[PDB]
Amino acid sequence: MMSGRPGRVPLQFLPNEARSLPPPKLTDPRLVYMGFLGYCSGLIDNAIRRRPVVSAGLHRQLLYVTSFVFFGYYLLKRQDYMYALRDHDMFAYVKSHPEDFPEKDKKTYGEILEEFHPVR
Amino acid sequence: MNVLQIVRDHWVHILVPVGFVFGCYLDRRSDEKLTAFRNKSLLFKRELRPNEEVTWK
Amino acid sequence: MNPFASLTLTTLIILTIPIMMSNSNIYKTNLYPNYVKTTVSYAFTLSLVPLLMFMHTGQEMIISNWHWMTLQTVELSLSFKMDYFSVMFIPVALFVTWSIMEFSMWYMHSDPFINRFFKYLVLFLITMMILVTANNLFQLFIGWEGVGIMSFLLIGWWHGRTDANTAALQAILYNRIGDIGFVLSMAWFLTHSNAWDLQQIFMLNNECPNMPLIGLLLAAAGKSAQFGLHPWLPSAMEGPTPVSALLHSSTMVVAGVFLLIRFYPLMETNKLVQTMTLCLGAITTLFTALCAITQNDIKKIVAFSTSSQLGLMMVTIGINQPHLAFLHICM
Amino acid sequence: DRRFLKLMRFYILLTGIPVAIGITLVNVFIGEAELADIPEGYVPEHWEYFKHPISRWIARTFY
Amino acid sequence: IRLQEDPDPEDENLYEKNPDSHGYDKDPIVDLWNMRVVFFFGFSIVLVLGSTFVAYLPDYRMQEWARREAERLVKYREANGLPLMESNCFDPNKIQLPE
Amino acid sequence: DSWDKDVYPEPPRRTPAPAPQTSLPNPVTYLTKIFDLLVDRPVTLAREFIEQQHAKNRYYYYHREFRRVPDITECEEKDILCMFEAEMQWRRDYKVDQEIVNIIQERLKACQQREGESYRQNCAKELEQFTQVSKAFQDRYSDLGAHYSARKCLAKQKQRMLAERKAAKEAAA
Amino acid sequence: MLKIIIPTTMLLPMTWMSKHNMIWINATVHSLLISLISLSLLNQLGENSLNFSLTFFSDSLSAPLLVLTTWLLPLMLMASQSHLSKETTTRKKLYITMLILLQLFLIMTFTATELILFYILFEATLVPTLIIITRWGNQTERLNAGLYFLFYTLAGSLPLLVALVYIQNTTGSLNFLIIHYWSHPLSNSWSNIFMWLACIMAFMVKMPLYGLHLWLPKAHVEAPIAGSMVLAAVLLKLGGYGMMRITTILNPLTNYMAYPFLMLSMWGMIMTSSICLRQTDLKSLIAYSSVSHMALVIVAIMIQTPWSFMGATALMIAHGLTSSMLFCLANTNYERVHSRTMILARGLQTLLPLMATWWLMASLTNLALPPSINLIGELFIITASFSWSNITIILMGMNMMITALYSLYMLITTQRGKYTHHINNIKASFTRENALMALHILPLLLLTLNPKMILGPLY
Amino acid sequence: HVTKDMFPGPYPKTPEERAAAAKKYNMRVEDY
Amino acid sequence: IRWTYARSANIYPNFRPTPKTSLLGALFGIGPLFFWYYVFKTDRDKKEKLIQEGKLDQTFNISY
């Protein structure tokens, strides 16, 4: 779908047109879940390595957390930019092809005859 | 007596209460992004009292 | 307002006070059976004033004090029908159970759980009063089933005895066969008359069809031990003699024919169902009287006699004489 | 069995008696609201559409 | 021996060491406090206060409002000869039938 | 009283005055004098005390006024906001209709008990009113099912109206 | 819903960070506190639902279920801590964690505004449930029970997943409100017939429908007591709640698609009630009785009337409470005699009087004695069925007769008669067990005073 | 206590497992 | 223990599909289902035919 999109330069995680969108907030629920994933990784690291799972290596658990949040922020930016691109192309295509997307003639339920099915 | 042991042993008792208050606060914030029809419904909309500016929060 | 309503209610409320007190301190002492017998005697004395007011001027009323729930267009409330049947049967039943409790204070004197026995007697009395004063079919069903379970618990009073438990379950079984018809009538009246209260049921059923009346007849045949569902009453003699005298001879087993009397305006307008109850009562009275003349157990003879009298009550209902049947209940 | 029954009754009553006493006191001295037509120009608070003072307190405090 | 396995141990009676056992814990103090917190928070709070909270919940289903509206409507319809209720739930003027 | 006499009618109450044709005293009158002394007067006093407390703490509640919104016949197909408001209005109207039917059934039950043995003839008006209101309610809300709506109710009304118009046209011939 | 969800989530850190001997105390205290908070969801509106956010909402159908779940958690904790007294601290914390995870999943399942989110949350309940059954069950049969429960549920659920994504692709939304307001009639075609079957079969196997129920005896019998409690009380109700939600897109196809299911449940309630008359395992008898009440719920949902839905809601609530009570009562005897055989320990009323009273109350509620809410639900469903067809009164009356027979038979065989001579280890009932029964039975009877709280949104 | 060999088994085909079944159920072979 | 095992867990290990078991399974499992379906379907078709011609009176049936 999006592979051969025009202007799509290779090996570029965020293109420069993404800087027009709002960056994700720092307390973004998805970013906080990223940090939680890092914290779980640190706890499981203590468990497998046979260390006290909660209080051993606070620097290591902390680094797990911050690296997970660091990757999550950029992942969120790229995801949001891809969805913005999707909506951008969809609206452009609906605009360029009005015949494929007609203006449906709206009618009220007072003139629309819906069939009644009794429950009995 | 023995405040250190009591606060090092029964400190977990704050977790569920403060989680309840955090849930209430997060419920509060959810309503803040659902006000596109505050004082706008065909049923409830009305003029604001002279110092009033919104109808619910 | 009018003392009739307050007195008719107070007669019912006083019965429940020794039940609430059945966990305080008197229930642990040897004064509990006399205490409950005394409240029953006081309730009998109070219930005479509504009876006297009816005797004077025919005071009758329905009381709907507490609204329970509304189901769209069906309002279910605690409604008491303080009519001739209620205000005449309540004093009779209270007098009889007063005598029964005084008797039990001597007959069950050596029972280690005599306090619980008297409490069960009061519970049965309360459920029967609910049955008799009920102004709608749900409340009547509450009385019906509470009477049934109290009968179950009192027939199997000596629960280490296999035959007593078998008899109690047998009573439950036959009465459940009757409950099928009771629930049939409830469903029909809800579906067609949109009411379980007697007033609207009588209003919307000038010509009552077969199905609800046959359901009511099935329930009555179950409760009053008519032929086909008869055997449980003589087997209910497994209970202590006060249980027999109170429930299964004089007060509880007339619930079925009382159910049919409560719907006599409906039964009045259906000849087929009238013939059915007339014939069922006839066969019941004949067969049960035939069994009794050869029985050797005195309690069995009297139980078959009670079944015969219930058959006679069914007969007099089946000839469009409901008030005669009520009089025979009281006598 | 006796000890359990005593404990259960105690812990039911421990708040039941204050609850019952407070409900009686509220009913006797505060009492229920009186219905009235909405005064001209006045928009009532949402708990002012209920009659029982305890119901009004619940509506005002929790909803 | 068919394998090295421990024999099935015998069940411990909480009453044997604690006649006053409430059945919660082998240690009498935590057993007592388990009983206390269970009874307090269950009966004293959730049952009594919870039942009272549900009992005095503000109008549920707006049944009182519906009854008052019905009373006003019944008064108006009867005082003016209008039917108490029309068979048509909606006005046949805002309905356009097909043919 | 609080309830309005027109919504809850009751015939003018007609009691016969006492006509003793005996010399033996009437036990009922003395049992009622004792009732008025030991029962009525103390609870009556207990009510003046309480209504005296409630008189000095007077406060109010109001009936909630809903204005009218466009109904489901005015909703363009799939116009979710208008459908929501119309559907809420329809459900409120349905509850009010249920309460109207409840008022009329209350009248019917009260008449049946009140008229005694003459209820069959004396309660014809209430039976007629119940017939009318129950027919109207049945036409509005019967057979919709557990998942009812203003749309299904309107479809049922349109089916009824098409049947009515066709029947009228074929009767005209 | 976050003021409910987040405190429940906070049970896990609190459980894992508490002392070894404060585990049960802390979990019980704070789960009761959460259950107190869940009661505020019973303040419902006549017409609309409580639409908190885009992702969670509450109405009169799901609020009593949420209260039932939050109430079941502490009772679970009281039931478990006896048989898990010899376990390690970490393993007790893992069991508590499983129970908390199950409660959290159930809470979000009953409030999910979207159908696919409901699907994931309702499928998530499998994992802690399966873990509980297979890890902490007592017999070698727990493994086969776990396999049956897992694969019955999944064979039901996967076609539902396919149907849900197809519906989202064709309708555009799986949002419950949008689904209701944009409801299209379902035409009569093989495509729509199989869409109906896919939408219905998962909830059918969950309830379970008679013929698809063989997992339930295994699972409810082999599970530890808390597992049986949840499986009987809240997990069966997922099928009924989901069926009530999803039947709004299946009309008028439900008019004739329900005939095989109506027949199956109407006859299988008779069949499983009869099976109870001959069950030699007490826990198996209690498990088999759930099938009949759930068959009644199936009929009520399939006939689609306001009275049928009211009765089904009330019956689900009442059955949850009663079945959990019965399982706890059987477990108290099992913990004494280490066996589920019913005629092993007879004449127990002369050894455990107040426990015999608890047994009588539980049997009476299973009897649907009026005015209990069991009877209210059963009677409402019976009346709706009578309107649906008068001949339904034969089968439902037969079922209530047989239900009375087996309930009182269980009572008589366990409590009455002569005590067993060689069983000399029936110790007096602990305060904990009596409190467990009391906390089962008291809210059940209090609901009779306010029955509209469990009559669903069609009240 | 109760081993696998003490449990009910399949129908006995030959008279030696029939006698073993009689022994397992505490009966005489001529009565089993 | 032998009695409780024979009645629960020994039955399927020793069940065989024979003409007797298959005939009985078909008769008792499938027979009542189709019997009741025929009864209820006939009753409801008669009811619906009455409703269509308005020959079934529902004067006070407003609760369903």
Short mmCIF file of N, CA and C in Angstrom, two decimals, chain G residues 149-223:
data_model
loop_
_atom_site.label_atom_id
_atom_site.label_comp_id
_atom_site.label_asym_id
_atom_site.label_seq_id
_atom_site.Cartn_x
_atom_site.Cartn_y
_atom_site.Cartn_z
N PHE G 149 -12.47 -27.12 29.24
CA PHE G 149 -12.95 -25.76 29.41
C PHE G 149 -12.31 -24.82 28.38
N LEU G 150 -10.98 -24.90 28.24
CA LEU G 150 -10.26 -24.07 27.27
C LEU G 150 -10.79 -24.28 25.86
N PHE G 151 -10.85 -25.53 25.40
CA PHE G 151 -11.10 -25.76 23.98
C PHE G 151 -12.57 -25.65 23.62
N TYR G 152 -13.49 -25.99 24.54
CA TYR G 152 -14.89 -25.66 24.32
C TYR G 152 -15.06 -24.15 24.13
N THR G 153 -14.49 -23.36 25.06
CA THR G 153 -14.63 -21.92 24.96
C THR G 153 -14.02 -21.38 23.67
N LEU G 154 -12.84 -21.87 23.29
CA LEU G 154 -12.16 -21.31 22.13
C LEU G 154 -12.83 -21.71 20.82
N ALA G 155 -13.28 -22.97 20.71
CA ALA G 155 -14.04 -23.38 19.55
C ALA G 155 -15.31 -22.56 19.41
N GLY G 156 -15.91 -22.16 20.53
CA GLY G 156 -17.00 -21.20 20.44
C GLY G 156 -16.57 -19.81 20.00
N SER G 157 -15.44 -19.33 20.53
CA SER G 157 -15.12 -17.91 20.49
C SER G 157 -14.49 -17.47 19.17
N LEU G 158 -13.69 -18.33 18.53
CA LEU G 158 -12.98 -17.88 17.33
C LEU G 158 -13.92 -17.48 16.18
N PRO G 159 -14.96 -18.26 15.87
CA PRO G 159 -15.93 -17.79 14.87
C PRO G 159 -16.59 -16.47 15.25
N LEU G 160 -16.77 -16.22 16.55
CA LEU G 160 -17.27 -14.92 16.99
C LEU G 160 -16.31 -13.81 16.62
N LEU G 161 -15.00 -14.05 16.77
CA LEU G 161 -14.00 -13.06 16.38
C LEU G 161 -14.11 -12.75 14.89
N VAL G 162 -14.24 -13.80 14.07
CA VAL G 162 -14.38 -13.59 12.62
C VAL G 162 -15.63 -12.78 12.32
N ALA G 163 -16.75 -13.14 12.95
CA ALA G 163 -18.01 -12.43 12.72
C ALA G 163 -17.91 -10.97 13.14
N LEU G 164 -17.25 -10.71 14.27
CA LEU G 164 -17.12 -9.34 14.76
C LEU G 164 -16.31 -8.48 13.80
N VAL G 165 -15.19 -9.00 13.29
CA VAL G 165 -14.42 -8.17 12.37
C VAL G 165 -15.16 -8.00 11.04
N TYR G 166 -15.91 -9.01 10.60
CA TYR G 166 -16.73 -8.84 9.40
C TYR G 166 -17.77 -7.74 9.61
N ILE G 167 -18.42 -7.75 10.78
CA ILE G 167 -19.43 -6.74 11.08
C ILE G 167 -18.79 -5.36 11.11
N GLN G 168 -17.59 -5.25 11.68
CA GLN G 168 -16.93 -3.95 11.69
C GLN G 168 -16.58 -3.48 10.28
N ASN G 169 -16.17 -4.40 9.41
CA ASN G 169 -15.86 -4.02 8.03
C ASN G 169 -17.09 -3.63 7.23
N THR G 170 -18.25 -4.22 7.50
CA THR G 170 -19.45 -3.91 6.72
C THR G 170 -20.28 -2.77 7.29
N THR G 171 -20.36 -2.65 8.62
CA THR G 171 -21.15 -1.64 9.30
C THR G 171 -20.33 -0.41 9.64
N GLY G 172 -19.02 -0.58 9.84
CA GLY G 172 -18.12 0.51 10.13
C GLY G 172 -17.79 0.67 11.60
N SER G 173 -18.58 0.07 12.48
CA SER G 173 -18.39 0.24 13.92
C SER G 173 -18.73 -1.06 14.63
N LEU G 174 -18.08 -1.27 15.77
CA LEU G 174 -18.48 -2.29 16.74
C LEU G 174 -18.91 -1.65 18.06
N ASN G 175 -19.07 -0.33 18.07
CA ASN G 175 -19.50 0.40 19.25
C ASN G 175 -20.93 0.02 19.61
N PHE G 176 -21.16 -0.33 20.88
CA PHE G 176 -22.47 -0.81 21.30
C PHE G 176 -23.57 0.21 21.00
N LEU G 177 -23.33 1.48 21.34
CA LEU G 177 -24.33 2.51 21.11
C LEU G 177 -24.61 2.66 19.62
N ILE G 178 -23.56 2.74 18.80
CA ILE G 178 -23.73 2.86 17.36
C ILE G 178 -24.45 1.64 16.80
N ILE G 179 -24.07 0.45 17.27
CA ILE G 179 -24.72 -0.79 16.85
C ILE G 179 -26.21 -0.75 17.15
N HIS G 180 -26.60 -0.23 18.31
CA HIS G 180 -28.03 -0.15 18.62
C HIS G 180 -28.72 0.88 17.74
N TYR G 181 -28.16 2.08 17.64
CA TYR G 181 -28.85 3.17 16.96
C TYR G 181 -28.89 3.00 15.45
N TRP G 182 -27.92 2.28 14.87
CA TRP G 182 -27.88 2.05 13.43
C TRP G 182 -28.30 0.63 13.08
N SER G 183 -29.22 0.05 13.85
CA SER G 183 -29.58 -1.36 13.69
C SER G 183 -30.26 -1.59 12.35
N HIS G 184 -29.75 -2.58 11.61
CA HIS G 184 -30.34 -3.05 10.37
C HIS G 184 -31.03 -4.39 10.60
N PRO G 185 -32.21 -4.59 10.02
CA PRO G 185 -32.84 -5.92 10.06
C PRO G 185 -31.96 -6.94 9.34
N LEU G 186 -31.95 -8.16 9.87
CA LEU G 186 -31.11 -9.22 9.32
C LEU G 186 -31.95 -10.09 8.39
N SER G 187 -31.58 -10.13 7.11
CA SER G 187 -32.36 -10.85 6.11
C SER G 187 -32.22 -12.36 6.30
N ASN G 188 -33.01 -13.11 5.54
CA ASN G 188 -33.06 -14.57 5.64
C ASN G 188 -32.21 -15.15 4.51
N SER G 189 -30.96 -15.48 4.83
CA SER G 189 -30.06 -16.08 3.87
C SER G 189 -29.04 -16.92 4.61
N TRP G 190 -28.36 -17.80 3.87
CA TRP G 190 -27.35 -18.66 4.49
C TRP G 190 -26.22 -17.83 5.07
N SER G 191 -25.81 -16.77 4.37
CA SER G 191 -24.81 -15.86 4.89
C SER G 191 -25.21 -15.32 6.25
N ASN G 192 -26.43 -14.79 6.35
CA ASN G 192 -26.89 -14.23 7.61
C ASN G 192 -27.13 -15.31 8.65
N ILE G 193 -27.58 -16.49 8.23
CA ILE G 193 -27.77 -17.59 9.17
C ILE G 193 -26.45 -17.96 9.84
N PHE G 194 -25.37 -18.03 9.06
CA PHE G 194 -24.08 -18.38 9.64
C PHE G 194 -23.46 -17.22 10.40
N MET G 195 -23.75 -15.98 10.01
CA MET G 195 -23.36 -14.84 10.83
C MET G 195 -24.04 -14.88 12.19
N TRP G 196 -25.33 -15.23 12.21
CA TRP G 196 -26.06 -15.41 13.47
C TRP G 196 -25.42 -16.49 14.32
N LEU G 197 -25.13 -17.64 13.70
CA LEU G 197 -24.52 -18.74 14.45
C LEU G 197 -23.17 -18.34 15.02
N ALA G 198 -22.36 -17.63 14.23
CA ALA G 198 -21.06 -17.18 14.72
C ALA G 198 -21.22 -16.19 15.87
N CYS G 199 -22.19 -15.29 15.78
CA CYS G 199 -22.41 -14.31 16.84
C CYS G 199 -22.95 -14.95 18.11
N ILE G 200 -23.60 -16.11 18.00
CA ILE G 200 -24.32 -16.68 19.13
C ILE G 200 -23.57 -17.84 19.80
N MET G 201 -22.80 -18.63 19.05
CA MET G 201 -22.32 -19.92 19.57
C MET G 201 -21.33 -19.76 20.71
N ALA G 202 -20.51 -18.71 20.71
CA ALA G 202 -19.56 -18.51 21.81
C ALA G 202 -20.29 -18.31 23.13
N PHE G 203 -21.28 -17.42 23.14
CA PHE G 203 -22.08 -17.23 24.34
C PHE G 203 -22.89 -18.47 24.66
N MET G 204 -23.33 -19.22 23.64
CA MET G 204 -24.03 -20.48 23.87
C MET G 204 -23.16 -21.46 24.65
N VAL G 205 -21.93 -21.68 24.20
CA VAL G 205 -21.06 -22.65 24.87
C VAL G 205 -20.61 -22.11 26.22
N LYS G 206 -20.62 -20.79 26.40
CA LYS G 206 -20.19 -20.25 27.69
C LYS G 206 -21.22 -20.45 28.79
N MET G 207 -22.51 -20.52 28.46
CA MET G 207 -23.55 -20.41 29.49
C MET G 207 -23.59 -21.58 30.47
N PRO G 208 -23.57 -22.86 30.05
CA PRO G 208 -23.52 -23.44 28.71
C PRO G 208 -24.86 -23.99 28.22
N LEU G 209 -25.03 -24.04 26.90
CA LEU G 209 -26.20 -24.68 26.32
C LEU G 209 -26.14 -26.19 26.52
N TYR G 210 -27.29 -26.79 26.83
CA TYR G 210 -27.34 -28.24 26.97
C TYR G 210 -26.90 -28.91 25.68
N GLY G 211 -26.00 -29.89 25.80
CA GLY G 211 -25.33 -30.49 24.68
C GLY G 211 -23.93 -29.95 24.44
N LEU G 212 -23.66 -28.72 24.86
CA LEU G 212 -22.34 -28.11 24.80
C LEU G 212 -21.77 -27.90 26.20
N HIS G 213 -22.28 -28.63 27.18
CA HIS G 213 -22.04 -28.34 28.58
C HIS G 213 -21.05 -29.29 29.24
N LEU G 214 -20.53 -30.28 28.52
CA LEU G 214 -19.74 -31.33 29.16
C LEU G 214 -18.46 -30.82 29.81
N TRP G 215 -18.00 -29.62 29.46
CA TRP G 215 -16.84 -29.07 30.15
C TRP G 215 -17.19 -28.65 31.56
N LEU G 216 -18.43 -28.19 31.78
CA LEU G 216 -18.77 -27.55 33.05
C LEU G 216 -18.69 -28.49 34.25
N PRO G 217 -19.25 -29.71 34.22
CA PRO G 217 -19.04 -30.59 35.38
C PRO G 217 -17.57 -30.81 35.69
N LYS G 218 -16.76 -31.13 34.68
CA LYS G 218 -15.32 -31.30 34.88
C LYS G 218 -14.71 -30.07 35.53
N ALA G 219 -14.95 -28.89 34.95
CA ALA G 219 -14.24 -27.69 35.36
C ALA G 219 -14.70 -27.22 36.74
N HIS G 220 -16.01 -27.20 36.98
CA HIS G 220 -16.52 -26.73 38.26
C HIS G 220 -16.26 -27.74 39.37
N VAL G 221 -16.02 -29.00 39.03
CA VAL G 221 -15.76 -30.00 40.06
C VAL G 221 -14.28 -30.06 40.40
N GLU G 222 -13.42 -30.07 39.38
CA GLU G 222 -11.99 -30.22 39.59
C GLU G 222 -11.33 -28.95 40.11
N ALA G 223 -11.95 -27.79 39.91
CA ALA G 223 -11.32 -26.54 40.29
C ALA G 223 -11.23 -26.42 41.80
#
